[PDB]
Amino acid sequence: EPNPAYPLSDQSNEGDWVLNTEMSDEFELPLDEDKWLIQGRNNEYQSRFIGRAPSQFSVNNAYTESGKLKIVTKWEPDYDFRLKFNGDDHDVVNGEKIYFENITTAAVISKKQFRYGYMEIKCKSANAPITSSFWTTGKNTSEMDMFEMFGGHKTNDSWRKRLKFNIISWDPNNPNYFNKINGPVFTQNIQVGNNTAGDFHVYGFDWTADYIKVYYDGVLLPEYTILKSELTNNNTNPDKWVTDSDYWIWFDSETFPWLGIPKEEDLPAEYQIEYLRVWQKN
């Protein structure tokens, strides 16, 4: 059996790793809401993000069970869907009003932040046309989407094995700012050999000032390594490196309406997180 004190990919502890306890959770107890924000709890919304239409985050769809954090996607047409903070009952996406209806998901966000570390999540994505995501934000700095999975994609088997990885700039001073370029600074489709919804797997993201590396079930996936020297072209384009920020960690599920929408028969579905281990260098 592997030693849980160290990253599955670094069992000899070459990294001299120490668990960051305020960012980590084995989810063996009821969810600690002094450690984790259930999005919407007491009307608190990280990033003022109530959900991606048609879905909305529900405080009842996040809880621990059987040793796992559960992010639950439900068909709940009678849910009391709220307005966005801007007053709208819809998102506007590619010219279309997409109304909030039918589906509730959840988002769980760390109440603490950290900068740099080995992030290891053991999880099974929701088996429906819904995302299961593991990501970060910092306040008007940037966002790393370690993965967006879509475990129950009905028509694209590649998506069933995909971790969509993104880096997004939230800094209006940055030429790669999301509301300037309307897209990520960097994106790649991490493809693993097994359906993300089929079983639990261990995903590792080693985040440093100079690189980000991806690990699957303890093994480096070198095809997906991100180097600061490459993204910035040897520091000639430094604004392309935006991940030197303190981050909150998010787990959530969302409808991506243009990718797919679940049927009632697909639901409920669960994005199950057996644990999150975040280590930092001693």
Ligand SMILES: O=S(=O)(O)O[C@@H]1[C@H](O[C@H]2O[C@@H]3CO[C@@H]([C@H]3O)[C@H]2O)[C@@H](O)[C@H](O[C@@H]2[C@@H]3OC[C@H]2O[C@H](O[C@@H]2[C@@H](O)[C@H](O[C@@H]4[C@@H]5OC[C@H]4O[C@H](O[C@@H]4[C@@H](O)[C@H](O)O[C@H](CO)[C@@H]4O)[C@@H]5O)O[C@H](CO)[C@@H]2OS(=O)(=O)O)[C@@H]3O)O[C@@H]1CO
């Ligand atoms: O339009 S204005 O220029 O006027 O600006 C308005 C507003 O001004 C107005 O407010 C009043 C209404 O009219 C008057 C006012 O009476 C105007 O002055 C500004 O105040 C407002 O300012 C915001 C706040 O400070 C900057 C603004 O945005 C900040 O929040 C950011 C969040 O919007 C952003 O949220 C995203 C969101 O949840 C996390 C973010 O990503 C998520 O999507 C991800 C996706 O990117 C990824 O690929 O996949 C993920 C998983 O699937 C997920 O889908 C959601 O889209 O997060 C940012 C992080 O830095 C900021 O959040 S925060 O950390 O700073 O809290 C502040 O709310 O801006 C208005 C115009 O927007």
